[PDB]
Each structure stands twice: as C-alpha cells, then as structure tokens.
C-alpha cells in the first residue's frame, strides 16, 4: 500500500493499486504523492 | 518615498482578512468581471430571452384557395428567464455532503469550471394555460472571482485558506485547466449615426457612390446589428442592412412611408423643412420622392403588405398567422432596433437622411471610423451574453423544427396538450448547449448562424499565460481591432492618431507586425458597463428650453440634441452650449453630493453620461449636441477646474475640450479641465519604467514589450498550478529606482529582477554588439537564478480506442519488473520518486494492460536533466474511478549560461558573453567588483540617457537608503533630475557626475579616466528557452533517402555558385545529402527497366545485371517468377541523387519517361 | 526567496542580518539607515538587505500537509 496526501484535507489516504481514488474523510478527488526517505546528493554548486 | 518594508512584512506574515490590500489591480481587471456581473444581475439575460420572442408550431392545413388556411392545435413557446446556479460538484449526489468547487480544484483536476444552466420553458396550447418547466441545458463555464464563483467577496486570508494566491485577480474562465479569456475588441459607436467615405461602396452598387451613413444600433441586451444608408448617384438613398449573413436593400422612402402613416409633404418638410427652398437638398428630395412614387403604393397598409409578401421567407416569422404583421415585424426587428417607438424611428431616420444629404454636398466632414473618437470596447461578458442568447434562440428554432417534422411525418404523435409529447420532443433533440459555449471558449471559432455584427469569426480568446506578472496584467488590459485589418497593409489605423490622450497608451504596444493594432488601455481609463436611468434627462431638457414637436418644429439655425440615438429636442447652438455646460455642472455637483454624506437618490444625471457638444463650423463635423448613456464605452477622469472635483469624460468630448495638462499650463477663460497627473496617460506596464521620459520612445516600446517577457515570479502559489511551463526567479528584489505606482499597483509581491552594480566600461573586449559580462563570483553567489517548471500530464483514457472497457492501469503487473531502470526511479506504483534527478533517456511512469499483462512505459522527452517535485493522481471525475490521469511537475534548473539575455528597464538587452573572473574585473577605491560590465558604445544611437539617470539614482538611493522616486514628468528644465541625484551623491561622498576612480585588475595601476558605476535593475529575460543540433548521421527519408526533418539550398546554392565552388556545391548538395550508384541501361537509355539477373549459377561469379525494356546459356537469364529473357547487355553504373530516382518513379507513373544517355 | 547569504558584489555574509535588521525599523523609529548600525560600509552589500523582497514568508502559507 502507498501513502498519499488528500489535496484539501491533508490526510494520509493509504490507497492501494487499482482502487477508487478519493479522500477517505473529505471526498476530494486529487491526491499528491508524498516525498519518502531516499538518498540524493547535489554538488554545492 | 521609502520602501514599504514593515508594512510589506506585516502583510506577508499575517495576511489581511478585511479586504484586498491592493485595490488598483482589481480596478484594473474590473471590466471583465463587472461585465459578467452585468450579465447575471441588472437584468441582462432576462432581456435577451424576452426579446427572443415566442415561437409557434401547429398542424398545417392547406388553404386550397381558401386564403385563410386553418390550424387549431397551436403551441407557442418561449423562454421566461435564465438562471445560472453556482458551480456545484457533479450535481448528482455522489453520496457526500454536496460541496462547492473552488477553481483551485478545476486547475488541479484538469477539468473545466462549469455550472448548471437552468431555463424556464413556458407553454401555450392556443388557450391561456402557460404552465412552466425548468430545463437543465448543460453546464456553462464561469469566470473566476465573478458573481457566480465561490471566491466573490472573499478576503485574501480566506483565499490563502483556499489554494489561490492572496491577491487573485479573476476575469478568466478555466477551460480544461488553461485560463482562457475573451479579449476586448473595438467596435463603432453605439447608436450614433456616423458618416463614411469608403471607396469600396462605389464598385458595390454601380449606381451607388462612396458617400454613406453607417449606424450600429443596439438593443437593450447589447445585441447590436448595423444598417447603413447608401447614397446612390441617382439621388435616392438605400437602406442597406444585414440579416442571416445576407445583405438586404430596400429603398429608404419605402420604409419611411411604411413606418408611420405619413403623407409626402411631411417627409419633405421634415428632411428639408428650413430656409424654404435650399437648392441642393430641395432638388435631391424631389428626385427621391418621385423615384419612389415610380412603382410603390400610397398608404402605410399597402406598403406593409407588400413588404411582408416580399420578406416572409427569410424572417423566421410564424408561417400561418398573418401578413401585415410581418411588415410590422420587420419594422420592429431590423430597421432601427435601439428605438422603441415608431414615430421616433421615423424622426431619427429623417435626421439621418438629412445628415447624409449634408455630407454629400460637402457641408459635413467625414467622421473617421479608424479613430477612438468613433470607437467603443466590447467587454467579455457582453459577448458571452450575445453568444448565449444566440444558442438559446437556435435551441428554440431546433425544437420548433423538431415539432414541425414530428407533425409532418404523417401523425406519429401529435398531442399539443399532452405534457408527455413535450417530454418526448425534448428528449429527442440535443439539449446540451453548455458544450457549445465551452467550445467557443476552448477554441474561439464563434460558430453562429448570424455573426451578431462581428467582422471576424476567429481568434476571440487568449490563453492567460501567467509567465510573469506584467504578462498577466497586459493580458487583462489590452484591446484589438481584429486581423481583418492586419491582412490589409496600410499606413492606416496602425497609426497613433490622437484621440487617445488618456484612453489607450501611446508607448505600450508590441513591435513588429502587430504593431499599432493592440493598444493596451491607459492606467486610469475605465469602461462604463452598468448603465443607469436617464428619464430625468428628457425631463430636464424640456425644462431647459428645448421641445420635440409632432409636425416639423424645426428651422434653419436650430441644431439637434440627441439622447443615445433618440431625438429629444432642437435648439440653437448657443443654447446647446449653455445646456451642455449646465448639465455638466449639475452632474459634477450632484456627484460630489452623492459620494459623501448627503443622501444618494437615483442620480439626477450620472457621471458616466457624456455631453458631446459638437460646435458648428463650415466643413466640420455635423453639429448637434449628443447625450450618450450606453454601456461599454471608454471613460476616464479629469478634474473640473471651475469646481474642484472629479468629472468623467469619453472620446467624444476629448476633441472639443481644452484639458490643460498641468496646474501651470492652465490659461484662463478657455481651459475648463485639468488632468490629474499626466502619468494618467500611459498604461500600467509602460508607466513602470523609471525616467521613462528620457529615452527615445522606441526604447520605451521595446522595454514594455520585453518586460512583458521577464523570467520573474509568476505569483506565490506555485505548488498548486497545473501549467505547462512556468519560470521562477530565485533571487528577486524591489528596484532601488521606482515609480510610486510600483508600490500602488502592488508589484512588491511579484519582483522581476535584481540590482546589478553596473559599470559602463569597454574593458573586457567581449562586450561588443550589445553583449555584456557577468562578474563570475557575482554569479556563483547567486545572481539571476532561474527555475523552470515543466509539468507534463499522462492520460491512459486516450489509449483506449473503442470496444473494450477500462484496461490500462498505473502500477506494475503482478510479475517481474526490470531493475536496470524501472525500479531505480519509479517507486512501486509506476509513479516516480519525488526528488529523483532524471536525464533524457529515463522512464517517468509505468502502466500495464490487463490482457497482455505486459508493463509499458513512458519516457522523458526533454533533453535537460530535471528533477521531480510533485506528482498528482488526478481522480478522473465525481468518483467511482481509478487513477486514470497523472500530472508530474519536473523542476529544471537554469543558472546564467553563456547566451541568456539580460536586459535593463530601458530596452538595453544583452547576452551574458563570458562571465569574467571576479579577480580580473576592475574595482573602485572601495573594492566592489562591478557585477555586470556594460559597453559604453551602446548608449549613443540608442539614447537610453534614462539609464544614465537611473544608474545615478541607484547609486544615490542605495547609499542613504531611499526608494528614489522616478515617475515620468516630475523633473523640469529649471532644475534637472541629474542635478538632484548629484546633490544626493555628493552628500553621500561619491563623485557628482557619477564617475568613480577604478583600478584595473589585469594590470593593477589605475585607469586614466574615471568610470561610471551605478546600481541598475537587471531583469533576466527568458527568450533563451529554445536555444543547437549537430547532425553527423542519422535516419533517412522514406522516399527520397534524404536526411529527415539542416537546410542548405535555394539561397545557399546562390552563395556557393557565387564563390565559384562547383565541387563544394556538388559535395554539400549531392554527396552528403543523398548519394546512390544506380544502374543505367546504356542502349535503351533508361534507368527503371533494368533488373539484376537471378539464379545464373551457384555462388560463382557476380550477378550480372541486364535490362528488360531492351530485351526480347551464358547471355540468357530468368526472372523471379521464372520468365526467361535475352538481350539487354549494355548496363553500367551512374551516380545520380536518390531524389532523381524518386522523380523517375513518380514520372513513369504518368507514363512520361526520360531516356538519359551515358558515354 | 530567503535573504541572499553572501551578497553578490562583495563577499560579506549577510544571511544573518535580516531578522536583526527588520527589528530595527519595526520598533526603533530608525529609518533606512538602520543598516548603518549593521556595519555595511559599501553600497554593493547594502542594496541587498535594503530592497529585499522576503517572499518566502508569503509562500510558506501553502503547506499541502497542513492537516486542516
Ligand atoms: Zn480531504
Ligand atoms: Zn524500359
Ligand atoms: Zn557586496
């Protein structure tokens, strides 16, 4: 399962693949993906 | 004036919940949104649907010589009112608290911003029942921050509570998520009969002549059409008009007699009742009267009956009712629509024909249609209302034709009393007009049966590119005349003829081909769009000395007074001037009463009313007082000098008032108006150019058209924007030299550039041909540092052609997934990691089919390494759907790279040429390396002396800490601005002319001559977005074997065979593009009828080619199918380009063939 | 966005001189020359913290993870 953000309510949705997409608490229909922990480097330039 | 810093921070940190801090942006966008507000309220659509009328249907019985063909079952239906409800969420209850749809979501979810459209259909069964029924007719878009959006009246804090930025503007319908907008067009004046000298008239009607009179008359619902008067050489006047895309021409005497029950002496003594027996007018009217007496009849009834029997076909009038009422229907619906009373249409027609005859004899000058004296603006919402009324009228005509066809078939169902029949018929026809309006907004092709009196039918809507703030405003202010003039290349209206002083900006207008067409409005020019009641104007005129008669109450000296197309009296020009002045003073005084404490009754005379007194003079404009009260005009404020208060005036009193432009210019007894402040003449983007009155005005033109294209902050809510390409500037600041209006118009929230320490110096040597340098460390510490946002959308619903249900889904099929790339970027769901750096050949999303179960992929097409900042899983719709849309916003980074245009606020665009090291740059005694070296040779022949003054002012203001005021037209010739900033500097300590003693870096010992260092405001441009393509080898063409689509030829060939370079031409054109060694038959001399020999022997020797057209054990040979041949031995190699082989092909397919010989 | 640490022309670090410059205008009744109490002698490091649009205190009001 993945963790998303309802656009308006800002509530972790926990929606699984091939499912009806909507906010579990508000009913909004737009979902951002959240930025997980992952290692990236950038030169300080 | 100082930088509002504390106030800026206390409006940033705790945003205002009271009201928008910046009222002037809203007064800048007010035209559009107040036009839509006029659409909904103020009874605009209701008037439209009332003036639609009623449409009838019935069962037709053939009269059969009866004459009165009978029909009993008649239904006459009409639209009673129109309601536009707020934009709810997919109205059908989705089992949730039915909430609203704030536009933020319409931008996110990539769906247009629509709302239900309710019509009030009404009945009649040839009785008196009139039962009603409300009909959903689809959903129409709705303007943001309009009267029908959920942002109206909201304060900025509640806007930050939503996802739109604090100082939102509104004015743009969100259609598919791209903010479309209806541009303002320019039209002729409402109802004022203008003259025309246009030569195309001549070859139009050959008995005709160039002299004509045009009038664009408009109904109460702003649904104008035209009807012009042609003066024909014979003497009579034709009443040209338009209907159903077709011209129509009935003589003016005909409708003059048809309108009222008139006798000919009345027509004569009305047109020319004056100076009894003036030669020219008297004989022309005589000739006209007799030329109509030729064929017509006598009374009004006979004329109306003839007119009906002529025009019953083209009018959509009821087929069965009667015949004379059709004549009345013409004389109500077409002749002169702005007027209601027949006798008054008659009076205005007499006045108009008198104006035409005066124009013919040279007693009246030709009014100029290509000048803002005779122009008005059409807003957005009024055009929207016209198109909505047209769609409703089409809908009624369509259900009428459906009922007529239902009755006509034989009689499948005919029950004009049964409501079930009406449900059947409504279910039959297309009931969705929401998609028609939404299509007009999505494309612009105004597809209507009648053009609504509009020349061009394409290009009505512009997409509001929020690329930079000035770009957004400049979208909201502009106007346009239409490309119907752009296609005609002339020294015409594209000229700045001056009845625009204070209405439309002189300087701000793009350069190049559209130069002169789209003139953005001035700063203060409003657009009066809410009319008011004016019956007190006729009451007061009748009280003031004028009287309208029934029989001709008119004589020689008496001139006319006109109330927005209605003749209200006649008076001598002295009394006309007295009336004009006293009306103006009554208007101003009661306005200053109405603004403050004293009660606000319906105004005696409104401010917006313009008293266009036109004084008499020989060979002048036709003199007669003109009182306008229509909406959609241009109107700007000045200060009335006898009083001391506001007064509004439009482009018809401009040309006749002495508006002294300063308190000091006023000359007594004549100058009766004062401009508030001449800054009021420029536009909003053009006014913000410090010392804009020092530069050669082409430089200010280039600076406007180039500051509309800066890489600047396109707002503050960027996390919630679904645009394709945004540009943002990491390090922006407020200018140190600024016009006060840069604070008034709330630009502080949207900076455009930084403050560069510019040294005017020719030292590096790289800075010729307008280029420049950029101090390296001044770059690597963060000078203009752009970030581009490219948000691309993926939609699986497109690759679902037809036949199956929903198949593709986002994610990875249950099974294997490649590790080499797909598991590196994409998380698990086929959606990329947030924050992982992509390259060109990199996968960005992943979806699989259900049947094949194989995972497909989509790759990042762009050629520059970008990151990933936000992905949106767009819920497809209302609900009950899978994620069938994704929106990924890559954040490309763009530092200053060699080639990125920088450009000050004077038109001084350059290119970052080399980025000199910070050690090899000069320095003053203080030690600051100049952040940017500009070249001195760029200021002569460019006249940007404004830039020298601005550098002075910057180095002066940064020192003490002032915000140096730089409004146009403050600094006079007595004490110059240069001397003021010089006093500033010499107080600070530096050199008074601005110079500064610099030491060079590459040698160390001082420069002999001092150098000029200031603090200029450098806004980085963004034209470098499309920079480069090197082709060593690659794909070839299908047919001609050419490199697939760099271009070398048809002018390059001129150059190469000019240099006398045969071998270079034959190389670059024949060798490197397409080279081939084709066999040719030497004897028969052709290239196609050759064939390689087949199955000669074992591996052995070479396949020795032969010919077919030249043909009839060693020599003989076979074919692929087995056919044997002999002969055709002379075959050799030639080298000819592949395109010639393709030409041989397409040529033989025509049977014509060239036989090229070979030696 | 935030104050440009290390002004461009000079090399001086002025990142830290914003919350200590603002609360001189805020309550000390001193004008734009407040920064002379900060120690900015030139006018290249001085037109940085003077005309600075601090546009991040306006953009941080759009936390999509607001929980509200
Ligand atoms: Zn929610
Ligand atoms: Zn042949
Ligand atoms: Zn510095």
Curated annotation (Swiss-Prot), chain A:
It comes from the Eukaryota. It is found in: Nucleus. Zn(2+) binds at residues 6, 9, 23, 26. One of its GO terms (molecular function) is DNA binding. GO terms for biological process: transcription by RNA polymerase I; transcription by RNA polymerase II; transcription by RNA polymerase III; transcription elongation by RNA polymerase I. Keywords: DNA-directed RNA polymerase, Metal-binding, Nucleus, Transcription, Zinc, Zinc-finger. GO terms for cellular component: cytosol; nucleolus; nucleus; RNA polymerase I complex; RNA polymerase II, core complex; RNA polymerase III complex. Component of the RNA polymerase I (Pol I), RNA polymerase II (Pol II) and RNA polymerase III (Pol III) complexes consisting of 14, 12 and 17 subunits, respectively. This is DNA-directed RNA polymerases I, II, and III subunit RPABC4. It comes from Schizosaccharomyces pombe (strain 972 / ATCC 24843) (Fission yeast).
Curated annotation (Swiss-Prot), chain B:
Keywords: DNA-directed RNA polymerase, Metal-binding, Nucleotidyltransferase, Nucleus, Transcription, Transferase, Zinc, Zinc-finger. Transmembrane segments: none annotated. Residues 1-23 are annotated as: Disordered. GO terms for biological process: transcription elongation by RNA polymerase I. One of its GO terms (cellular component) is mitochondrion. Component of the RNA polymerase I (Pol I) complex consisting of 14 subunits. This is Probable DNA-directed RNA polymerase I subunit RPA2. CDD domains: RNA_pol_B_RPB2. Its EC number is 2.7.7.6.
Curated annotation (Swiss-Prot), chain C:
GO terms for biological process: transcription by RNA polymerase I; transcription by RNA polymerase II; transcription by RNA polymerase III; transcription elongation by RNA polymerase I; transcription initiation at RNA polymerase II promoter; tRNA transcription by RNA polymerase III. Zn(2+) binds at residues 7, 10, 44-45. It is found in: Nucleus. GO terms for cellular component: cytosol; nucleolus; nucleus; RNA polymerase I complex; RNA polymerase II, core complex; RNA polymerase II, holoenzyme; RNA polymerase III complex. GO terms for molecular function: DNA binding; DNA-directed RNA polymerase activity; zinc ion binding. InterPro entries: RNA_pol_su_RPB10, RNA_pol_suN_Zn-BS, RPABC5/Rpb10. PROSITE patterns: RNA_POL_N_8KD (PS01112). Keywords: DNA-directed RNA polymerase, Metal-binding, Nucleus, Transcription, Zinc. Belongs to the archaeal Rpo10/eukaryotic RPB10 RNA polymerase subunit family. Component of the RNA polymerase I (Pol I), RNA polymerase II (Pol II) and RNA polymerase III (Pol III) complexes consisting of 14, 12 and 17 subunits, respectively. DNA-dependent RNA polymerase catalyzes the transcription of DNA into RNA using the four ribonucleoside triphosphates as substrates. Common component of RNA polymerases I, II and III which synthesize ribosomal RNA precursors, mRNA precursors and many functional non-coding RNAs, and a small RNAs, such as 5S rRNA and tRNAs, respectively. Pol II is the central component of the basal RNA polymerase II transcription machinery. Pols are composed of mobile elements that move relative to each other. In Pol II, RBP10 is part of the core element with the central large cleft. This is DNA-directed RNA polymerases I, II, and III subunit RPABC5.
């Amino acid at each position: 399962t993945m963790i998303y953000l309802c656009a308006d309510c800002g509530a972790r949705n926990t929606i699984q693949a091939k499912e009806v997409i909507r906010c579990r608490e508000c009913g909004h229909r737009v979902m951002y993906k959240m930025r997980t922990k992952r290692m990236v480097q950038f030169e300080a330039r | 004036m100082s930088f509002q810093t504390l106030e800026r921070e206390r409006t940033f940190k705790n945003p205002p919940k009271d009201g928008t801090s910046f009222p002037d942006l809203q007064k800048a966008v007010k035209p559009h949104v107040d036009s839509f507000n006029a659409l909904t309220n103020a009874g605009l659509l209701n008037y439209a649907v009332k003036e639609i009328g009623e449409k009838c249907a019935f069962d037709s019985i053939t009269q059969e010589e009866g004459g009165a063909l009978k029909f009993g079952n008649k239904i006459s239906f009409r639209v009673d009112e129109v309601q536009i409800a707020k934009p709810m969420l997919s109205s059908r209850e989705r089992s949730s608290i039915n909430r609203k749809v704030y536009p933020a979501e319409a931008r996110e979810r990539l769906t247009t911003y629509k709302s239900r459209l309710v019509l009030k259909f009404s009945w009649s069964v040839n009785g008196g029942p009139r039962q009603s029924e409300m009909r959903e007719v689809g959903m129409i878009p709705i303007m943001v921050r309009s009267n029908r959006c959920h942002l109206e009246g909201l304060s900025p804090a509640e806007l930050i509570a939503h996802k739109e930025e604090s100082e939102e503007m509104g004015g743009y319908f969100i259609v598919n998520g791209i903010e479309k907008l209806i541009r303002m067009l320019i039209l002729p004046k409402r109802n004022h009969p203008t003259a025309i000298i246009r030569p195309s008239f001549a070859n139009r009607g050959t008995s005709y002549s160039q002299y004509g009179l045009s009038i664009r008359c408009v109904r109460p619902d702003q649904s104008s059409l035209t009807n012009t008067l042609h003066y024909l050489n014979n003497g009579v006047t034709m009443f040209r008009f338009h209907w159903r895309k077709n011209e129509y021409l009935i003589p003016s005497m005909m409708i003059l007699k048809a309108l009222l029950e008139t006798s000919d002496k009345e027509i004569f003594e009305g047109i020319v009742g004056k100076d009894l027996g003036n030669t020219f007018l008297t004989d022309r009217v005589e000739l006209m009267l007799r030329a109509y007496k030729s064929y017509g009849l006598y009374s009004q009834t006979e004329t109306l009956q003839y007119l009906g029997s002529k025009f019953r076909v083209v009018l959509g009038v009821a087929e069965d009712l009667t015949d004379v009422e059709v004549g009345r229907f013409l004389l109500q619906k077409v002749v002169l629509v702005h007027l209601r009373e027949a006798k008054d249409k008659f009076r205005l027609l007499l006045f108009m024909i008198r104006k035409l005859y005066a124009l013919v004899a040279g007693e009246c000058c030709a009014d100029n249609p290509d000048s803002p004296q005779h122009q008005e603006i059409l807003l957005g919402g009024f055009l929207y209302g016209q198109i909505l009324k047209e769609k409703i009228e089409d809908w009624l005509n369509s259900i009428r034709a459906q009922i007529n066809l239902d009755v006509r078939r034989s009689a499948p169902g005919v029950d004009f009393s049964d409501r079930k029949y009406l449900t059947r018929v409504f279910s039959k026809i297309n009931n969705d007009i929401g998609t028609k309006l939404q299509y007009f907004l999505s494309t612009g092709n105004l597809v209507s049966n009648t053009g609504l009196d509009l020349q061009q039918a394409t290009g009505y809507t512009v997409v509001a590119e929020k690329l930079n703030f000035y770009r957004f405003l400049s979208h909201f202010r502009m106007v346009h005349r239409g490309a119907f003039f752009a296609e005609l290349k002339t020294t015409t209206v594209r000229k700045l003829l001056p009845e625009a002083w204070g209405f439309m900006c002189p300087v701000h207008t793009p350069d190049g081909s559209p130069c002169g067409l789209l003139n953005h409005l001035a700063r203060k020019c409003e657009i009066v769009t809410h009319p008011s009641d004016v019956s007190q104007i006729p009451s007061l005129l009748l009280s003031l000395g004028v009287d309208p008669p029934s029989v001709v109450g008119h004589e020689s000296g008496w001139g006319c007074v006109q109330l927005d197309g209605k003749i209200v009296g006649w008076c001598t020009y002295k009394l006309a001037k007295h009336v004009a002045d006293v009306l103006r003073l009554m208007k101003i005084e009661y306005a200053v009463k109405l603004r403050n404490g004293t009660a606000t009754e319906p105004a005696k005379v409104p401010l917006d009313l313009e008293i266009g007194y036109v004084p008499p003079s020989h060979n002048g404009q036709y003199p007669g007082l003109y009182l306008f009260s229509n909406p959609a005009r241009m109107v700007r404020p000045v200060k009335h000098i006898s009083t001391g208060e506001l007064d509004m005036l439009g482009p018809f009193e401009q040309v006749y008032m002495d508006i002294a432009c300063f308190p000091k210019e006023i000359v007594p007894k004549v100058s009766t108006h004062v401009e508030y402040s001449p800054t009021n003449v420029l536009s909003i983007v053009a006014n913000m150019t410090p010392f804009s009155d020092f530069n050669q005005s082409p430089r200010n033109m280039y600076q406007c058209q180039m500051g509309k294209q800066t890489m600047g902050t396109p707002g503050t809510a960027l996390r919630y924007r679904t645009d394709n390409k945004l540009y943002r500037l990491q390090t922006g600041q407020t200018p140190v030299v600024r016009p006060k209006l840069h604070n008034t118009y709330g630009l502080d929230h949207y900076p455009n550039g930084t403050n560069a320490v510019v040294a005017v110096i020719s030292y590096t040597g790289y800075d010729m041909e307008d280029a420049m340098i950029l101090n390296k460390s001044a770059h690597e510490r963060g000078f203009g540092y752009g970030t581009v946002y490219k948000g691309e959308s993926f939609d699986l619903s497109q690759k679902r052609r037809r036949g199956e249900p929903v198949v593709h889904h986002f994610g990875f099929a249950p099974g294997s997934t490649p590790r080499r790339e797909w598991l590196q970027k994409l998380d698990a769901d086929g959606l990329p990691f947030i924050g992982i750096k992509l390259e060109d050949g990199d996968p960005i999303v992943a979806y699989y089919d259900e049947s094949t179960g194989q995972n497909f992929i989509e790759t990042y097409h762009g050629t520059e390494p970008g990151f990933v900042d936000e992905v949106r899983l767009l819920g497809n719709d209302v609900g009950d759907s899978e994620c069938q849309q994704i929106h990924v916003k890559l954040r490309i980074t763009r530092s200053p790279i060699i080639g990125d245009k920088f450009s000050s606020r004077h038109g001084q665009k350059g290119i970052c040429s080399q980025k000199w090291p910070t050690v090899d740059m000069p320095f003053t005694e203080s030690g600051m390396q100049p952040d940017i070296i500009i070249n001195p040779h760029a200021f002569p022949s460019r006249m940007t002396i404004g830039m020298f003054i601005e550098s002075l002012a910057g180095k002066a203001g940064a020192c003490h800490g002032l915000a140096q005021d730089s409004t146009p037209f403050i600094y006079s010739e007595q004490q110059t601005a240069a001397d003021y900033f010089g006093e500033q500097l010499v107080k600070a300590g530096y050199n008074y002319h601005g110079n500064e003693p610099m030491y060079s870096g590459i040698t160390g010992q001082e420069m002999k001559a001092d150098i000029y260092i200031g603090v200029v405001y450098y806004q980085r441009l963004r034209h470098m977005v499309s920079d480069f393509q090197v082709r060593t080898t690659g794909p070839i063409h299908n047919l001609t074997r050419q490199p697939v689509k760099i271009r070398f030829g048809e002018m390059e060939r001129d150059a190469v065979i000019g240099h006398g370079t045969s071998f270079l031409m034959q190389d670059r054109l024949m060798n490197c593009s397409d080279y081939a060694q084709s066999w040719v038959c030497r004897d028969c001399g052709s290239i196609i009828s050759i064939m390689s020999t087949i199955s000669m022997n074992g591996v052995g020797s070479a396949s020795e080619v032969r010919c077919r057209s030249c043909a009839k054990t060693s020599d003989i040979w076979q074919d692929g199918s087995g056919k044997k041949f002999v002969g055709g031995t002379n075959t050799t190699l030639i080298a000819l380009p592949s395109v010639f082989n393709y030409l041989t092909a397409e040529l033989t397919a025509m049977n014509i063939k060239m036989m090229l010989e070979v030696k | 966005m935030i104050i440009p640490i290390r002004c461009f022309s000079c090399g001086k670090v002025i990142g830290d001189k914003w919350d200590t410059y603002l609360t001189l205008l805020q309550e000390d009744n001193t004008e734009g020359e407040a920064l002379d109490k900060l120690g900015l002698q030139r006018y290249c490091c001085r037109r940085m913290i003077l005309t600075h649009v601090d546009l991040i205190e306006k953009l941080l009001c759009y936390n999509p993870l607001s929980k509200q």
